[PDB]
């Protein structure tokens, strides 16, 4: 029964998921003056040429674009990571208004939305084993600002009418996630968590500095989705973001000067 309402929102999650108040929770504010350049970080390696998208699912919290992760097809390596992380899904978090929606913030600035490309460490064999490890997942986070349309996002926007409500899915093959990346792979990185229940502390966060631009019409179509199931009272899927959590004993590292 967790969600993003007044009665079941992020301030309530700790009652069923006490790790909500833990030492490495996400998201966080990225203070750009306190993040230190780490010359030992490697360039990110984003290898998405062989990505196999399968399906898009409205899960009642967001929509997920799911990939075939039964082989090393779309992988994230390098940067702060040891070994190979396989892409399993991507999703977004967004606002009711353009002035909010991102989960990470930059010097307390909120973006209109945030893309999460979720990857799991292949040394743990499957995603369910990986989420039980402190280095199990790598999530690539990309901010969205409202301005020019993102052409590589339109195939996602155009299928959302077919998955309006919770539990609906649609075939979503041959989608190329390279079309969601910005030009620069400059990033910030820190150890954190899933941002939704069960809030497991299993994520290496890699947040790109350069946002992508999407149009007002693209993000308006995200905000026509529903949290509810078919035939239930309509509750628009908006403001599906967790706010920034305490940094505690953590350092955010920059890949760039
Ligand atoms: N916003 S985010 O990128 O941090 C993100 C949040 C949640 C998830 C996610 O995979 N969850 C659904 C399953 N659960 C994991 C799970 C638990 C037990 C058994 C198996 C799996 C969470 C992935 C990324
Ligand atoms: Zn997310």
């Amino acid at each position: 029964h967790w969600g993003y309402g007044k009665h079941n929102g992020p301030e309530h999650w700790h009652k069923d998921f006490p790790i909500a108040k833990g030492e490495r929770q996400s998201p966080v504010d990225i203070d750009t003056h306190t993040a230190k350049y780490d010359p030992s970080l490697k360039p990110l390696s984003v290898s998405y040429d062989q990505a196999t998208s399968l399906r898009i699912l409205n899960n009642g919290h967001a929509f997920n674009v799911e990939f075939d992760d039964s082989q090393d097809k779309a992988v994230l390596k390098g940067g702060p990571l040891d070994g190979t992380y396989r892409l399993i899904q991507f999703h977004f978090h967004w606002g009711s208004l353009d002035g909010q929606g991102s989960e990470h913030t930059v010097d307390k600035k909120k973006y209109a939305a945030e893309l999460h490309l979720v990857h799991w460490n292949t040394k743990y064999g499957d995603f369910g084993k990986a989420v039980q490890q402190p280095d199990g997942l790598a999530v690539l986070g990309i901010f969205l600002k409202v301005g020019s349309a993102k052409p590589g996002l339109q195939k996602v926007v155009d299928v959302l009418d077919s998955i309006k409500t919770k539990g609906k899915s649609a075939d979503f093959t041959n989608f190329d996630p390279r079309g969601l990346l910005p030009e620069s792979l400059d990033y910030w990185t820190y150890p954190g968590s899933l941002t939704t229940p069960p809030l497991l502390e299993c994520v290496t966060w890699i947040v790109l500095k350069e946002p992508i631009s999407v149009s007002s019409e693209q993000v308006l179509k995200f905000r026509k989705l529903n949290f509810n199931g078919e035939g239930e009272p309509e509750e628009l899927m908006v403001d599906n973001w967790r706010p920034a959590q305490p940094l505690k004993n953590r350092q955010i590292k920059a890949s760039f000067k």
Side-chain angles (χ1 to χ4, degrees):
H1 287 192
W2 71 267
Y4 295 98
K6 25 255 225 283
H7 299 292
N8 63 356
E11 303 280 46
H12 295 270
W13 295 353
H14 70 101
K15 293 177 280 176
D16 284 301
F17 305 95
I19 205 174
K21 293 179 150 48
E23 298 304 302
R24 61 172 274 187
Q25 288 291 289
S26 295
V28 301
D29 183 56
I30 300 162
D31 192 283
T32 65
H33 285 114
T34 76
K36 193 189 162 67
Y37 170 63
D38 185 347
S40 72
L41 286 169
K42 303 170 205 308
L44 210 46
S45 175
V46 188
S47 298
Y48 288 172
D49 41 292
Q50 298 290 307
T52 299
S53 66
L54 288 179
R55 192 180 72 140
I56 192 173
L57 171 72
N58 178 334
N59 63 18
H61 307 296
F63 64 86
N64 291 353
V65 174
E66 298 163 354
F67 288 80
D68 172 16
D69 65 344
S70 71
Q71 300 183 261
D72 279 345
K73 281 178 170 188
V75 305
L76 186 65
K77 297 165 15 67
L81 304 174
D82 297 332
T84 300
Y85 290 68
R86 282 199 191 152
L87 179 62
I88 178 167
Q89 56 103 327
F90 72 75
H91 60 276
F92 302 83
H93 307 262
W94 63 89
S96 52
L97 307 154
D98 297 347
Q100 62 190 29
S102 65
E103 295 209 302
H104 293 90
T105 59
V106 177
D107 295 333
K108 297 301 180 78
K109 177 190 173 64
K110 300 173 165 79
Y111 287 86
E114 186 178 328
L115 170 58
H116 288 163
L117 297 127
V118 181
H119 313 72
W120 60 268
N121 195 329
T122 63
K123 76 186 275 167
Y124 299 122
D126 68 59
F127 176 83
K129 285 298 248 258
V131 301
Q132 296 179 61
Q133 315 298 327
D135 62 347
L137 293 197
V139 184
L140 185 58
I142 305 179
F143 298 117
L144 280 62
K145 69 180 187 184
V146 171
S148 312
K150 190 70 164 177
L153 180 64
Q154 192 60 33
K155 286 191 213 172
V156 171
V157 165
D158 281 334
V159 79
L160 296 179
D161 280 335
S162 76
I163 60 153
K164 183 179 182 184
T165 52
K166 178 178 165 51
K168 292 247 260 144
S169 68
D171 293 309
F172 201 65
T173 51
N174 300 290
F175 179 79
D176 188 348
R178 293 178 294 181
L180 299 175
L181 302 176
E183 166 193 335
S184 186
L185 293 187
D186 293 342
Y187 62 87
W188 298 282
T189 184
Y190 76 96
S193 74
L194 305 181
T195 71
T196 62
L199 297 168
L200 297 170
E201 288 180 339
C202 61
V203 180
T204 302
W205 277 98
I206 300 170
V207 177
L208 295 192
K209 173 164 165 207
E210 187 187 332
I212 61 165
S213 288
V214 303
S215 67
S216 186
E217 295 84 359
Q218 288 184 317
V219 73
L220 283 164
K221 286 182 189 175
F222 281 26
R223 300 180 185 131
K224 291 180 169 168
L225 290 161
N226 282 189
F227 289 128
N228 53 282
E230 178 184 14
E232 296 174 358
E234 186 170 39
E235 191 58 358
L236 295 178
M237 187 178 280
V238 295
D239 293 320
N240 59 351
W241 51 276
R242 193 190 190 189
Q245 301 300 309
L247 193 58
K248 298 193 163 159
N249 189 44
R250 290 179 291 181
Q251 276 191 340
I252 301 178
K253 295 175 195 172
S255 75
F256 58 90
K257 291 207 79 205

